[PDB]
C-alpha cells in the first residue's frame, strides 16, 4: 500500500529511465514481456491476470527516442499511451519548452498523472529525471513541477538533475537554461541531487577500469543509486527509512536542499573477490572525495547532515564502529550547530547484478546522500559562465523571440546571488 511515480522527460531522462527499468524488472523477477514466469507494488500495478505495468511516464517532444523504446524488447511492457511524444523539438531553447510547444503537451501529461494517481492508495511521492542542459528537459520539467506543486500541494517530489561539468560541455548555451531551470526548481522541488557527468567518468576510469565509457555505463550506476535509495520501501530491514523521513533529517532550511551523492563499492569481478569488502573499508571509500558522484570537493566546505544507506548482511554495531572512526578523522569536519549528523539505514537485500554489465555481485554496499556547504562552487562557476555572455547579450534573441521577457534573466541571477549568500551565512560558526 505504498507507491511512487517516476517522471522521465528529455533524452537524458528517458535514457536513464530505460537504465533503471531494466534493473527494477530484473530485481523483481519480471520478464521483459511483463509476465512473471508482494514487493512489486511500490513500482508496479497488477492488472488482474498476468502482466505488470510500470508506474512511469515518458515525455519528449522529439520522437526518435520514444520510437526506439516502442520497438525494442520492452515494447510490451509500457502502456502504449503513456509514452507521450511531440513532433517538434525545443532545440536546446528553454523558452520554447516553457512557453511555445510545451504548453500544448503538458495537459496530456497531467491527465496521465491523474489517471495513474487515482490508482495508488498510499502515494509516497514523485520522482523526476531530467538533464538540465537542454531545452525540452529543463523547460518541461519546470512546467510540470510548477503544475504539480499546485495540483497536489504537500506531496513530496524528488529531482535527479544532471548539471553540466565544470569544463566539459556538449552544448554552448547550456548555462542559460541551467540557471533558469535552477531558478524554477529552487522554490518548487523538495530534494535535488547532483549528477554531473565528469565525476562519474572519473569513477568509471579509476575503479571500473573502462577507458572508453558510453552513456549506458553512467546510467547503470545512476540506476543502482536509485535502487539503493528506494530499497527500504520494498524489502524487510532492521532500520527502515521512508521518503517522507528526509526533509526532517537532511534539509536544515527550506532553501537548502541541494546535496551530492556517492556509492561504494564500485569494482569489477576480475579483482573483487581478492579483498574482503568489510563494512569499514566500504564506508571509508564512500567518504573519499574522489568518489563523489558530482565533481565537487567536500574538503572545501563543512558537512551539514549525512544520510547513508546500507544493504546486505551488515550488522548495526559494525556501522557504529565505523561512524566513530569517521568522526575521529581530522580531515572531515561538521558544522558547529550539528553535534550528530548521521542517519543510518540498514537493509537485508543485497544489490542485484545486471547481466553483461560492469559491476560484480557483492554482499555489502553503501549509498550516501550528504548535504554539504561546499556545493556553492558549482553555482559560482555557472554564474561566472553566465555573466560572460550575458554582458554582451549574446544568444538572447533566440529567447526573446520565443515569448520570454527581457527581465527574466536578471531575476534568476538575483536568486543565485541570494542562494550563494545564504550558503555563506549558514556555514559560519556561532
Amino acid at each position: 500500500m505504498r507507491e511512487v511515480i517516476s517522471i522521465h522527460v528529455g533524452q537524458g531522462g528517458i535514457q536513464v529511465g530505460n537504465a533503471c527499468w531494466e534493473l527494477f524488472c530484473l530485481e523483481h523477477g519480471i520478464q521483459p514481456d511483463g509476465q512473471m514466469p508482494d514487493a512489486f507494488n511500490t513500482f508496479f500495478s497488477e492488472t488482474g491476470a498476468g502482466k505488470h505495468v510500470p508506474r512511469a511516464v515518458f515525455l519528449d517532444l522529439e520522437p526518435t527516442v520514444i520510437d526506439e523504446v516502442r520497438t525494442g524488447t520492452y515494447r510490451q511492457l509500457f502502456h502504449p499511451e503513456q509514452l507521450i511524444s511531440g513532433k517538434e523539438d525545443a532545440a536546446n531553447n528553454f523558452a520554447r519548452g516553457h512557453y511555445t510547444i510545451g504548453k500544448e503537451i503538458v495537459d496530456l501529461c497531467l491527465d496521465r498523472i491523474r489517471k495513474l494517481a487515482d490508482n495508488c492508495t498510499g502515494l509516497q511521492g514523485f520522482l523526476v529525471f531530467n538533464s538540465v542542459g537542454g531545452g525540452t528537459g529543463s523547460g518541461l520539467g519546470s512546467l510540470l513541477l510548477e503544475r504539480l506543486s499546485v495540483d497536489y500541494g504537500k506531496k513530496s517530489k524528488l529531482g535527479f538533475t544532471i548539471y553540466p561539468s565544470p569544463q566539459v560541455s556538449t552544448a554552448v548555451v547550456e548555462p542559460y537554461n541551467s540557471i533558469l531551470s535552477t531558478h524554477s526548481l529552487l522554490e518548487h522541488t523538495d530534494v535535488a541531487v547532483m549528477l554531473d557527468n565528469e565525476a562519474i567518468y572519473d569513477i568509471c576510469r579509476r575503479n571500473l577500469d573502462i577507458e572508453r565509457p558510453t552513456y549506458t555505463n553512467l546510467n547503470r550506476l545512476i540506476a543502482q543509486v536509485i535502487s539503493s535509495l528506494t530499497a527500504s520501501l520494498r524489502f524487510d530491514g532492521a532500520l527502515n527509512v521512508d521518503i517522507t523521513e528526509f526533509q526532517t533529517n537532511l534539509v536544515p532550511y527550506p532553501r537548502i536542499h541541494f546535496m551530492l551523492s556517492s556509492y561504494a563499492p564500485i569494482i569489477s569481478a576480475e579483482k573483487a573477490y581478492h579483498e574482503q569488502l568489510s563494512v569499514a573499508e566500504i564506508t571509508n571509500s564512500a567518504f573519499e572525495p574522489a568518489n563523489m558522484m558530482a565533481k565537487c570537493d567536500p574538503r572545501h566546505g563543512k558537512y551539514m547532515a549525512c544520510s547513508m544507506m546500507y544493504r546486505g548482511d551488515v550488522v548495526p554495531k559494525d556501522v557504529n564502529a565505523s561512524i566513530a572512526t569517521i568522526k575521529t578523522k581530522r580531515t572531515i569536519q561538521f558544522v558547529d550547530w550539528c553535534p550528530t549528523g548521521f542517519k543510518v539505514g540498514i537493509n537485508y537485500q543485497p544489490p542485484t547484478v545486471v547481466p553483461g554489465g560492469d559491476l560484480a555481485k557483492v554482499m555489502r554496499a553503501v549509498c550516501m546522500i550528504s548535504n554539504s556547504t561546499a556545493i556553492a562552487e558549482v553555482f559560482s562557476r555557472l554564474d561566472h559562465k553566465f555573466d560572460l555572455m550575458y554582458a554582451k547579450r549574446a544568444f538572447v534573441h533566440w529567447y526573446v523571440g520565443e515569448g520570454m521577457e527581457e527581465g527574466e534573466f536578471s531575476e534568476a541571477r538575483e536568486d543565485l546571488a541570494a542562494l550563494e549568500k545564504d550558503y555563506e551565512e549558514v556555514g559560519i560558526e556561532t
Partner: protein
C-alpha cells in the same frame, strides 16, 4: 682537506648556469598561475557591476 676538485672553471660556470636556469624555470611556472587567479577575480567584479547596473535599469 675536503673537496677542492680541480674541475675546469668553464664546467663550474656551466653547472651554475644550469642551476640558475632550473630555478628560473621553476619560478616562471607558479607566478603565471597566481597571476591567472588574480586576473580571474577582476572579471567577476566587472561582470557583477554590469549586471547590477542593468538589473537597476530593469527595476
Amino acid at each position: 682537506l675536503l673537496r677542492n676538485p680541480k674541475a675546469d672553471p668553464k664546467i663550474l660556470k656551466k653547472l651554475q648556469e644550469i642551476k640558475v636556469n632550473y630555478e628560473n624555470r621553476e619560478e616562471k611556472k607558479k607566478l603565471e598561475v597566481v597571476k591567472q587567479e588574480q586576473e580571474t577575480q577582476k572579471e567577476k567584479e566587472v561582470l557583477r557591476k554590469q549586471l547590477m547596473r542593468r538589473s537597476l535599469e530593469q527595476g
